[PDB]
Amino acid sequence: QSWINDIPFIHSYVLTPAQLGGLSNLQYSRLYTRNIGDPGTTAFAEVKRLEAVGLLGPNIMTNILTRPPGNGDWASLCNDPYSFNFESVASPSIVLKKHTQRVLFE
Amino acid sequence: QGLVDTTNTVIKIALSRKPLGIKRLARIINYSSMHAMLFRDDVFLSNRANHPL
């Protein structure tokens, strides 16, 4: 009930890229070519453009760079590169898929 | 292991074999609100008096 009526929060949340914790899976460069390349530089480049043109505030660029880190293993770095070690919650598809694999193979 | 056909029926069968957990199931149900609050507390609503180089 708190955050759903914060309209600049919903703006700044559906528009921040999904690599950085937001919702947006459509960078502007996705509209011209496919998803090839580094995801992280595309995320930070879109955040840079959206800050430049005045959509997204200057708060968010300072806060993403100063973000406290997540857990991380060497296995978490190796099983997925291009991966910022931020504290992030796990997708239910990944959790349930991996649980069903590790149950059926017992 | 990434070649199994995890449909919803397969997932219900494997949950009927072994239940998920207590902390993980609370994270599965509350996923959208926890994701939104994590975005809110980390990158939208923060002081961050250190400014990096």
Burial class (CB in 10 A: 0-12, 13-18, 19+), A104: middle
Q: Which residues of B touch A62 (CB under 8 A)?
A: 48, 51
Q: Which pair of tokens denotes residue A1?
A: 């009930």
A3 closest CA partner among B7, B33, B8, B29 = B33
Q: Which 8-state DSSP code applies to residue A89?
A: P
Q: Do B14 and A87 touch (CB under 8 A)?
A: no
SS3 B8: helix
Q: Which 8-state DSSP code applies to residue A51?
A: H
CA dihedral B42, A69, B49, A18 (to 10 degrees): -40
Are the CB atoms for A12 and A36 separated by under 8 Å?
no
Q: Which 8-state DSSP code applies to residue A23?
A: S
Q: How was this structure determined?
A: cryo-EM
CA distance B5 to A100: 10
Task: Return the exposure string of B18-38: e unless at least 16 CB atoms fall within 10 Å of the residue's CB, then b.
Answer: eebeeeeeebbeeeeeebbee
CA distance A90 to A44: 22
What's the first-to-final CA gap in chain B, in angstroms? 44
Other beta carbons less than 10 A from residue B39's beta carbon: 22
Chain B contacts to A (CB-CB under 8 A): 1-2, 4, 6, 10-11, 14-15, 17-18, 20, 24, 27-28, 31, 34-40, 42-44, 46, 48, 50-52
CA distance B40 to B18: 35
Q: Which residues of A touch B39 (CB under 8 A)?
A: 13, 16, 21-22
Are the CB atoms for A86 and B42 separated by under 8 Å?
yes
Close Cβ partners of B31 (under 8 Å, ≥ 6 residues apart):
A89, A91, A92
